[PDB]
C-alpha cells in the first residue's frame, strides 16, 4: 500500500514533471521564438542601420 | 516489488523528466536570458538604429 501510494506519488512526480517540462519546453521553444524574433529583428535593424 | 520497480521506472523517468525539466528550464532560462540579451540587443539596435 505505501508502495502503491508511492506508485501514485512517483506517477504524480512524473505527471507534475511532464506538465512542468511541457511548460519549460513550451516556454523554452516559445522564448526561443522570441530569441529568433528578437535576433531576426536585430539583424533586420542592423541591415537598416547599415 | 512491482511497485518498487514502478517507483524505480518512475524514478528513472523522474530523473529523465527532472533532468529534461532542468535542461528544458536551462533552455527556458537560456531562452529567457538569450531573450534578455536580445531584449537588450533589440533595444540597443532600436536605439542605435534610431
Amino acid at each position: 500500500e505505501k508502495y502503491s501510494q508511492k506508485e501514485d506519488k512517483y506517477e504524480e512526480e512524473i505527471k507534475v514533471l511532464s506538465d512542468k517540462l511541457k511548460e519549460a519546453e513550451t516556454r523554452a521553444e516559445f522564448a526561443e521564438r522570441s530569441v529568433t524574433k528578437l535576433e531576426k529583428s536585430i539583424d533586420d535593424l542592423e541591415d537598416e542601420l547599415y | 516489488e512491482k511497485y518498487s520497480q514502478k517507483e524505480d521506472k518512475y524514478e528513472e523517468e523522474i530523473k529523465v523528466l527532472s533532468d529534461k525539466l532542468k535542461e528544458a528550464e536551462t533552455r527556458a532560462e537560456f531562452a529567457e536570458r538569450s531573450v534578455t540579451k536580445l531584449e537588450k540587443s533589440i533595444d540597443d539596435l532600436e536605439d542605435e538604429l534610431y
Binding site: - | 532542468k22 536551462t26 532560462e29 537560456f30 536570458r33
Partner: protein
C-alpha cells in the same frame, strides 16, 4: 592478411582506451590503475598476485591502495605503465604486438623523456614492427571530420589546447593548462567535507570520481544557480554509496565543474579554460581567427559534464567580437574522440609509410621520435 590491421591506444591519465585501428569504437576501455594489496593477507590459496591492473582493481578496491601511474600526462612510474599495456594486449585484446603496428597518443608540450621512453618500451618490451606517438588534439579533430578548429582537449591527465588551420598547426599558439578531471576530483572531495562527508582514501576517491561523472553539471550562470541554492529542491540529489550510505549534494554539485572557469577556487592563478582558448586564438594570425572562433572542438573525458558547451559559448561570445558568430562543436561521443582519431589515422593508406619502423629505431636509437614525428 592485407594491411595487418593496426593497434591504437589512448593513454591520457585515468583510462586506457584501446582496440583495433579500422573500427569505429575501441574494444577495451578500462581505468589506468595499478592497485597493490596494502593489507597483508592471511589465508592459504590466495592469489598471491603482487598487484591488480585495470577494472579488476575497481572490483577489488577496498584492500588495494591504487596508484595512477600517469599524472599530468607524465608517467610517474614506468613498470606500472608497462603492466597496464601488458594487461591491454594479453588480458583484453589477445594480440601479439609483433603482429601489429601500434599507435600511442600523447599530450602536447609534454617532456621529451615520456615520448622517448615510451618508444624505448614499445620496441624493447613488447617486440613490435612499428609504432607512432601522436598528439591527442589532432586525433580528436580527425575524429570530428573537420580540417580546421581549435581543439580543447581535457582529460583526467591535463588540459591542452591546439589551434589548427587547414591541417597545419601553430606551435606558439598551443596552450597547456594544469587543470584536469583529477584536480576536480581533489577539489570535490574537499568541498564534500563542509557537508560532513569525509572521503580520505584512494578507494572512495574513485567513488567521488563516479559521483562527479554523473551528478556534477556546469551552471549557465554560476551566481544565479548559487542564489537559487537557497531554496533547495532540484539542486539536491540523493546518491547511493556502495556502503549503503546515502549522500545528499546541493550547490556543492555544480561548483565543482565551475573550477574550470574559476581556478581561483583551486588557488591557481592560471586562467579559466575560456580565457586559455582566447590566449591560444590571440596568439594566432589575424586572418584565420574567424573560423577558430566558429570551429571550437571539445574533446576528452572532463568535457563530458552537462552544460559545458553552453557556458563556453556564453563566455567566449561575451569576451570576443560579437561581429562574428561563435559556434562550438562539442559532439556526444567526445570522450572517445582521441581513440577514434587514432583509428582513422592508422587506417589511412599514406600514414602506413610515416610509421616509426623497428628497423629505423634499431639503427638510429630512441631519440628519433622528435626528428620524425610532431
Amino acid at each position: 592478411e592485407d594491411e595487418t590491421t593496426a593497434l591504437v591506444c589512448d593513454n591520457g591519465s585515468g583510462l586506457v582506451k584501446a582496440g583495433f585501428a579500422g573500427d569505429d569504437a575501441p574494444r577495451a576501455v578500462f581505468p589506468s590503475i595499478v592497485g597493490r594489496p596494502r593489507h597483508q593477507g592471511v589465508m592459504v590459496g590466495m592469489g598471491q598476485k603482487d598487484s591488480y591492473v585495470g577494472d579488476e582493481a575497481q572490483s577489488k578496491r577496498g584492500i588495494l591502495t591504487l596508484k595512477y601511474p600517469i599524472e599530468h600526462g607524465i608517467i610517474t612510474n614506468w613498470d606500472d605503465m608497462e603492466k597496464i599495456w601488458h594487461h591491454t594486449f594479453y588480458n583484453e585484446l589477445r594480440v601479439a604486438p609483433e603482429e601489429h603496428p601500434t599507435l600511442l597518443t600523447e599530450a602536447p608540450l609534454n617532456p621529451k623523456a615520456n615520448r622517448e621512453k615510451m618508444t624505448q618500451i614499445m620496441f624493447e618490451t613488447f617486440n613490435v614492427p612499428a609504432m607512432y606517438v601522436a598528439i591527442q588534439a589532432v586525433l580528436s579533430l580527425y575524429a570530428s571530420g573537420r580540417t580546421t578548429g581549435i581543439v580543447l582537449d581535457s582529460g583526467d591527465g591535463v588540459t591542452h589546447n591546439v589551434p589548427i588551420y587547414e591541417g597545419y598547426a601553430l606551435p606558439h599558439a598551443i596552450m597547456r593548462l594544469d587543470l584536469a578531471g583529477r584536480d576536480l576530483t581533489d577539489y570535490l572531495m574537499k568541498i564534500l567535507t563542509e557537508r560532513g562527508y569525509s572521503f580520505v582514501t584512494t578507494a572512495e576517491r574513485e567513488i567521488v570520481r563516479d559521483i562527479k561523472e554523473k551528478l556534477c553539471y556546469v551552471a549557465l550562470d554560476f551566481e544565479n544557480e548559487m542564489a537559487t541554492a537557497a531554496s533547495s529542491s532540484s539542486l539536491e540529489k540523493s546518491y547511493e554509496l556502495p556502503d549503503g550510505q546515502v549522500i545528499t549534494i546541493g550547490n556543492e554539485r555544480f561548483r565543482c565543474p565551475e573550477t574550470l572557469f574559476q581556478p581561483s577556487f583551486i588557488g591557481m592563478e592560471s586562467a579559466g579554460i575560456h580565457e586559455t582558448t582566447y590566449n591560444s586564438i590571440m596568439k594566432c594570425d589575424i586572418d584565420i581567427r574567424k573560423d577558430l572562433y566558429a570551429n571550437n572542438v571539445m574533446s576528452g573525458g572532463t568535457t563530458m559534464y552537462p552544460g559545458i558547451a553552453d557556458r563556453m559559448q556564453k563566455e567566449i561570445t561575451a569576451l570576443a567580437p560579437s561581429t562574428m558568430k561563435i559556434k562550438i562543436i562539442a559532439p556526444p561521443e567526445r570522450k572517445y574522440s582521441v581513440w577514434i582519431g587514432g583509428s582513422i589515422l592508422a587506417s589511412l593508406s599514406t600514414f602506413q609509410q610515416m610509421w616509426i619502423t623497428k628497423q629505423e629505431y634499431d639503427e638510429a636509437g630512441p631519440s628519433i621520435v622528435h626528428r620524425k614525428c610532431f
